[PDB]
Amino acid sequence: SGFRKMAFPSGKVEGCMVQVTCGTTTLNGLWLDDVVYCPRHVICTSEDMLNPNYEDLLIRKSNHNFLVQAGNVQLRVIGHSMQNCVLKLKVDTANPKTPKYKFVRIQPGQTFSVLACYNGSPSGVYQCAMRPNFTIKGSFLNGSCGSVGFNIDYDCVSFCYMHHMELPTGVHAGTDLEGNFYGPFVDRQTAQAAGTDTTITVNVLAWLYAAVINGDRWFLNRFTTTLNDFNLVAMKYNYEPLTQDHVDILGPLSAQTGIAVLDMCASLKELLQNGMNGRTILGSALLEDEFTPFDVVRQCSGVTFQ
C-alpha cells in the first residue's frame, strides 16, 4: 500500500547520456545507436541567444567542432544535421548500451520521468507531467539542457522530451526528440510566457481513486452529478473539461473500486467548492493532477520493467 510520486527506473537512460561541447557551450546529449541528439542551441554563445540565426551559425561548424564524450571515452563525429530544434550528430560507434526505444510526442496531461543531467552525468530522476499549456514544472539548472524525459513499457524506452529552456516564470519548455517544441515556445531568449495553467481533471480523479484504494475516503459523499453540471464547476476553477473519453479511461478504476465515475466527480466538485478544511489526501493538502489513470493502475498493481 501507499502512493508515491514514482519515476521509472533510469538505468536504461543513464547508459545513453553523453556530454556535447561546441566551443564554449557544454550540455547533454542522448546517444542511441550511432546518433547523438542534443539541443541545437549548443552552437550558440550567450551573445547569440537573443536573435540567433541557427542556419547561419551552423555553416561555420564542422564535424570536428562537436566534442562528444561518453563518460571518459571520446566519440568520433562523422556527420551532423539539424532537424527542427535538435542537432543530430552521427558517430562512428553504436552505443552498446542502447536500449530498445521509440520517439513519441506526448499529449498534454500525460506524465513522464525526467533524468536530470549535467556534463553528461546523471544527477537525479523525478516524475513530470506535460501541462495543458505545454510547459513542465521541473528542476533544471544551467547545464541541464539536453536532459530527456521518457516512459518505460517493459523493455522499451519511449523518449518524449528534451529540455531546452527555462521561462522567466520559472517553468520549463522543450521539444520531442524530433526537435519540435511542445507548445508555442522557441529556442530564443525573447518575451515568451506560459498561458493559463489549467488542472488536469482526469488525473485528479484518478488520484482520488488511488486515495480510496488506500483508505483515504473522507472525501466520498452522498452526491452525484452530470458531465455538463460538473464541467460548469471545472471551468470556474480552471480545470480542464471532462469528456466521455476521460470517463471511459477511468472505467477500470471505477470497476475496481465500485465508485461510479460521476459519483467521484461529485466528490471532486465538493472539494473544489469547499476546500479540504485542513485535511489531507494521500499526504497532500492540494488536489494532485500529475498521476494519469495508467499511473494509478501501474503503481497499484506492481508492473515491472526489463
Write out the three cell numbers for 139.
Answer: 528542476
**Residue 166, interface with its own copies (CB under 8 A)?**
yes
Residues sharing a CB contact under 8 Å with residue 153, sequence separation 6 or more, in sequence order:
305
Question: Hey, is 257 helix, strand or coil?
Answer: helix
Q: Is 135 or 231 the residue whose CB approaches its own copies more closely?
A: 135
Q: Which of 21, 284, 294, 297 binds its own copies (CB under 8 A)?
A: 284
User: Distance between CA atoms of 3 and 11, rounded to whole angstroms?
Assistant: 22
Question: Hey, is 258 helix, strand or coil?
Answer: coil
Three-state secondary structure of 209-263:
HHHHCCCCCCCCCCCCCCHHHHHHHHHHCCECCCCHHHHHHCHHHHHHHCCCHHH
**Residue 139, interface with its own copies (CB under 8 A)?**
yes
User: What's the min distance (Å) between Cβ of 90 and ligand A82?
Assistant: 4
Residues 191-210 that bind its own copies (CB under 8 A): none
Catalytic residue status for 145: yes
Q: Which of 271, 265, 219, 266 is nearest to 242 (CA)?
A: 265
- Binding partner of residue 88 among Cl ion, its own copies, ligand A82, none, CB under 5 to 8 Å per kind? ligand A82
- How far, in Å, are 96, 102, 295 from residue 146 at the CA level? 20, 17, 25
Q: Which of 16, 128, 145, 160 is catalytic?
A: 145
Q: Which of 22, 38, 41, 265 is catalytic?
A: 41
**Residue 143, interface with its own copies (CB under 8 A)?**
yes
**Residue 164, interface with ligand A82 (CB under 6 A)?**
no
The number of CA neighbours under 13 Å toward the Cβ of 248 is 3
- How many of the chain's residues bind Cl ion (CB under 5 A)? 4
Q: Which of 71, 79, 170, 283 binds ligand A82 (CB under 6 A)?
A: 79
User: What's the min distance (Å) between Cβ of 34 and ligand A82?
Assistant: 8
Beta-sheet pairing, 35-39 with 156-166: unpaired
**Residue 12, interface with Cl ion (CB under 5 A)?**
yes
Task: With contacts defined by CB under 6 A, name the span among 78-86, 193-201, 236-244, 263-271 that binds ligand A82.
Answer: 78-86
Angle CA(265)–CA(269)–CA(272) in degrees, nearest 5?
135
User: What's the min distance (Å) between Cβ of 185 and its own copies?
Assistant: 16
**Residue 232, interface with its own copies (CB under 8 A)?**
no
**Residue 164, interface with Cl ion (CB under 5 A)?**
no
Torsions phi, psi for 120 (to 5 deg): 75, 10
- What's the length of the chain? 306
Active site residues: 41, 145
Binding site for ligand A82 (CB under 6 A): 35, 63, 78-81, 88, 90
Binding site for its own copies (CB under 8 A): 1-12, 14-15, 115-119, 121-126, 137-144, 166, 170-172, 214-215, 275, 278, 280, 283-286, 299-306
